[PDB]
Every structure is written in structure tokens, then in C-alpha cells.
Amino acid sequence: NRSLIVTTLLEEPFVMFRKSDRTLYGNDRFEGYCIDLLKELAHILGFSYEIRLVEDGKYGAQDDKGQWNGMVKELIDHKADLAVAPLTITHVREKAIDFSKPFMTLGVSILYRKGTPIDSADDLAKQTKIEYGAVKDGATMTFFKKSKISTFEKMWAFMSSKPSALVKNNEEGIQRTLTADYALLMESTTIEYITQRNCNLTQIGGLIDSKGYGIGTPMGSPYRDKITIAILQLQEEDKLHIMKEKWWRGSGCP
């Protein structure tokens, strides 16, 4: 039947333009962990597909009227059949779209320069010299905004007061940490990737929550269950382990 439309977004090492001299077109343009995962899903389920980068370049957040943007909006409006990305499974997004079981588990943590006394979210929260923030309107910022834990309520109050503390995307955030006394609240699997390529950066503390990435589908999708079975199959075969090693392997870095 018709090829499924896959909405996605550039984010290293999940989805990237592969290197080439000639101008690549169509699906051939892309590589990365999520691309490999998509190829597995397409084979297991037996579908053809066309990858389309989400127009507004966003994952999905609600405005002050409840309207969604990004990949989440693309699924809601049935402009795409699947979202294949590091799309964080959150309760609020589950109200609007369906997710497969997670293909990767992670948690919010801290990216910061190496060799520092800072050791935790508590240390950052109880001072003002070192600035810190998160990707604006991302799943992380949302976690802080909703938190009722004391340390995280204070940190959120800190990000709310300075609009400049938040960053537009991971790239801006990582460079902030490299060019200023700045700590980025960031999903741990990206921190893992970054710290293995930048030896002067490190993760501070542990994971302050636990969450996963899943394949997004519109609510009532005829593919969501089959996708979950496929991911379970891949995990049982150690394929998601192999796939992550393939794409996270970098440098390295003590």
C-alpha cells in the first residue's frame, strides 16, 4: 500500500545528513541511530516509507491555548504516520499521540565543564554564579516546570526569571557550556555522546528522573502495536544494544 510518511528532525547521532559530494535526495540523504531503527521497523513490519524533516524543526510543545507544534503536531494532524526521533515519552504528550514501548531509556542530567567542585543539582541550585538552563520548551524544561521537589522548584524559578538561561537547541546549549560558566540540563544519552567526544566536558551527578524515547504515532494508529512488538523483538536480539554502540562510539575520552 501507500508508503508511510515518517516525520523526523536532525539531531546527532540519531539523525544526520550523511557525507557526500553529490547532492543526495530522498531517504538516501540520512543516517544515524534512528535511521537504522527505522530500517529495522520497515523490514520487520514490511512497509515502505518517505522521510520528511518536520517543517518547524520542533519536537512538540503546547502553547497557551493547548495547540501543539513540531512532530507531535504533525502526527496529531495526520500529516505523518510515524515520528522516528529522540522523542521523549511524557505523560502530556501521551494525551495527544500514542507511543510505542521505549527503544531507549535515559534521564535528565547535567552537562558541565570538567574538574569542578560541582557534584549535583543541589550544588547548582544553592548558588547564582554559575548559570544553568535547558532547551526551551523541551521535555526537560517541562520536567522542571512541573516539579514539586524543592531543589527543582528553585532551579525552575531560576530559569523562569532569566529568559536568557534557556537555549534554543542542544547545539546552543553545548557551546554555552564550552564558552561560559554555564551548566546544561540535558538528556543523559546525549550527554553520553558528547562527553566521549569532548574531553573537557563531563556529566555532573546522576539521573534525576527516568524516562524513554518511543516511536510516535497518531492516536488510534494501526501500526503502534506492531511497532511495539518489533522493538521488543529487537531488544530480545540485543540489536538496540548493538545499534547504540555503533553510533555512540567516539574518540575516545577518559
Ligand X SMILES: C=C(C)[C@H]1CN[C@H](C(=O)O)[C@H]1CC(=O)O
Annotated binding-site residues for L-glutamate read: 86, 88, 93, 139-140, 187
Q: How far is CA 247 from CA 34, 53, 92, in A?
A: 10, 20, 29
Closest CA to 165 of 132, 141, 194: 132
* DSSP class of 83: E
Please work out the total of residues on this chain that contact a copy of itself, with binding judged by CB under 8 A. 34
Which CB atom, from 72 or from 234, has the smaller least distance to a copy of itself?
234
**C-beta nearest to ligand X: residue:** 138
Distance CA(20)–CA(28), nearest Å, equals 11
Interaction pattern, residues 140-159, with ligand X; x per rule: CB under 6 A: xx------------------
Extended beta strands in the chain, E state: 4-8, 16-17, 30-31, 49-53, 82-83, 97-99, 104-106, 108-113, 131-133, 182-187, 201-204, 211-213, 216-218
Phi-psi region of 115 (alpha: psi -120 to 50; beta: other; left: phi over 0): left
Residue 2 Cβ vs ligand X, minimum distance, rounded to whole Å: 27
Interface with a copy of itself, residue 78, by CB under 8 A: no
Coil, helix or strand at residue 141: helix
Q: Binding partner of residue 55 among ligand X, Zn ion, a copy of itself, none, CB under 5 to 8 Å per kind?
A: none
Q: Which of 18, 43, 52, 241 binds Cl ion (CB under 5 A)?
A: 52
Asked if 135 and 167 count as a contact pair (C-beta separation under 8 A), the reply is yes
Q: From the list Cl ion, ligand X, Zn ion, none, which binds 238 (C-beta under 5 to 8 Å, kind-based)?
A: Zn ion
72/231 with CB nearer ligand X: 72
213 contacts 87 by C-beta, under 8 angstroms: yes
Q: How far is the CB of 112 from ligand X (least distance, A)?
A: 15
Residue 47 interacting entry, from Zn ion, ligand X, Cl ion, none, C-beta within 5 to 8 Å by type: none
87 binds, among a copy of itself, Zn ion, ligand X, none (CB under 5 to 8 A by kind): ligand X
Handedness of CA 212, 214, 218, 220 (dihedral sign): negative
Q: For residue 196, what is the enclosing H or E element?
A: none
Provide, rounded to whole angstroms, the least separation between the CB of residue 133 and ligand X. Answer: 10
Query: Which residues are near Zn ion by CB under 5 A?
Result: 40, 78, 91, 94, 192, 236, 238, 241, 248
Contacting residues toward ligand X, per CB under 6 A: 11, 59, 86-88, 134-135, 138-141, 169-170, 186-187
